[PDB]
Structure formats: structure tokens, C-alpha cells
Amino acid sequence: GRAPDSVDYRKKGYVTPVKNQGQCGSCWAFSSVGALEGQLKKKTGKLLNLSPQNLVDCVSENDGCGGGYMTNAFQYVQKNRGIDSEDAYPYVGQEESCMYNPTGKAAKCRGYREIPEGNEKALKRAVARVGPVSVAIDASLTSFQFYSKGVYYDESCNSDNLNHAVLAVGYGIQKGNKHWIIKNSWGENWGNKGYILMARNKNNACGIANLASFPKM
Numbered sequence: 609g610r611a612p613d614s615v616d617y618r619k620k621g622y623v624t625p626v627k628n629q630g631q632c633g634s635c636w637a638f639s640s641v642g643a644l645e646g647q648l649k650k651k652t653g654k655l656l657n658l659s660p661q662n663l664v665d666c667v668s669e670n671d672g673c674g675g676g677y678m679t680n681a682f683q684y685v686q687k688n689r690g691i692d693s694e695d696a697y698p699y700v701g702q703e704e705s706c707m708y709n710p711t712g713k714a715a716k717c718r719g720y721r722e723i724p725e726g727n728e729k730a731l732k733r734a735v736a737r738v739g740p741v742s743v744a745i746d747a748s749l750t751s752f753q754f755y756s757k758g759v760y761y762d763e764s765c766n767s768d769n770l771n772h773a774v775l776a777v778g779y780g781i782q783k784g785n786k787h788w789i790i791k792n793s794w795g796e797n798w799g800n801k802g803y804i805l806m807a808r809n810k811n812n813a814c815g816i817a818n819l820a821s822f823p824k825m
């Protein structure tokens with residue numbers, strides 16, 4: 609069974625508005641909540657902002673504003689038996705004491721799956737079947753950071769230099785250039801209303817399929 613040629617989970621109401629992480633190195637936490645928000649919508653029919661601050665403060669196997677992995681975040685939610693809503697545990701952009709409150713719990717996690725390393729076909733199939741998928745990329749180039757439009761490709765991107773965590777919310781094509789639809793956490797003023805289209809099936813450009821995972825619930 610082949611997946612659809614294009615998919616956009618924003619059209620299905622799976623994707624919350626674009627957030628701004630500020631100076632804190634919490635990309636991993638926004639990536640993780642985005643993937644959880646998608647699964648929560650699929651489960652309950654309700655689209656709700658989940659708490660990246662809950663993750664920043666409480667995932668002891670991560671480094672708060674110094675960075676983290678999404679898989680560690682999913683493990684925390686699984687162990688903790690929940691994650692709070694944004695409303696119950698708001699974002700402040702600095703690491704603080706863990707103040708998780710189970711009465712504000714808005715989602716749970718049964719585990720996570722990792723996409724086979726470097727496999728863009730497997731990533732495509734996972735996005736199609738599951739929903740938004742957490743991904744890591746090389747976002748270090750100024751060409752990435754100044755993105756405004758089109759399908760982003762830069763030969764200098766290094767798939768071994770994973771330095772940013774974002775969310776793949778779909779995939780498709782523009783002017784014949786296959787792409788991934790990527791939600792960033794640098795605010796709506798960045799990119800195209802907070803989004804970037806990144807080259808798809810161009811030899812795993814920017815490491816898009818090197819550290820991709822999604823939560824189960």
C-alpha cells in the first residue's frame with residue numbers, strides 16, 4: 609500500500625499555531641509537544657497546546673535550555689503518566705523547578721517509535737500513517753535562517769550536524785520540487801508564517817530523516 613503523494617496535517621486541524629521559543633535552547637521541547645499535539649487531536653478530536661515548559665523543567669535526562677532529545681521527552685511523558693497543557697504550565701523561556709501538576713494533565717504517552725536512520729521513504733510513510741513527526745536538522749546555514757519561500761536546498765548542509773529540532777507536518781511538491789512541510793518554533797515572523805519547505809528525496813538533505821521519531825498514545 610502506497611502513501612498519498614501529498615499530505616498536510618494543518619488542513620486536518622492537527623497543528624497548533626506557531627510558537628516562539630525565544631533564546632532558550634528548547635527546540636527539542638517544542639518539537640516533542642508538536643508531535644504529541646498531533647496524536648492528541650487524532651485521539652480526542654481536540655486540538656490543544658501542550659506544555660514545552662513542563663518538558664524543559666522536568667525532563668531530567670535532557671538539559672533544559674541547553675538542549676535535549678525528543679525521545680527523552682517522550683520517555684518522560686510515558687514514565688510520568690502525563691504532560692500538562694500550556695495553560696496549566698505556561699512557557700517562560702528559562703529553566704525552573706519542575707512544577708508538573710497531574711490535575712492539568714492533557715495527554716499521555718505509551719512510548720515512541722524511531723524512523724530508520726536516513727530513510728526518507730520511511731519518514732514519508734510514517735507522516736502519512738501517524739501524523740506530524742519530530743525531526744532533527746542542520747539549521748546552521750544562514751541560507752536556512754533567512755528562508756522566505758520556495759523549497760529550501762543548500763549543498764553545504766551537513767546531515768551529520770544535527771543542531772535544531774522541528775516538526776514535519778506533511779510533505780508534497782512545489783514547482784516540481786518535492787518537499788517536507790516543516791513547522792519551526794522561531795515565531796510566525798520567521799520563514800513563511802513560521803514554516804519552511806525543505807527538499808525531500810535529495811539524499812536526506814540537512815539530515816531530515818536522521819533522528820526522526822513520533823509518540824504513541
Ligand SMILES: *[C@]1(O)CO[C@@H]2[C@H](C#C)CN(C(=O)[C@H](CC(C)C)NC(=O)c3ccc(-c4nc(N5CCN(C)CC5)sc4F)cc3)[C@@H]21
Binds near residue numbers: 772819
Ligand atoms: C535547540 O533549541 C536548537 O538550538 C539549541 C542547541 C544549540 C546550539 C541545539 N538544541 C537541541 O536541543 C539539540 C536538538 C537535537 C535533536 C539536534 N539537542 C541538544 O543539543 C542536546 C541533546 C541532549 C542533551 C542531554 N543532556 C543531558 N544531560 C544534561 C546535564 N545533566 C546534568 C544530565 C543530563 S542528557 C541529554 F540527552 C543535551 C543537549 C537546541
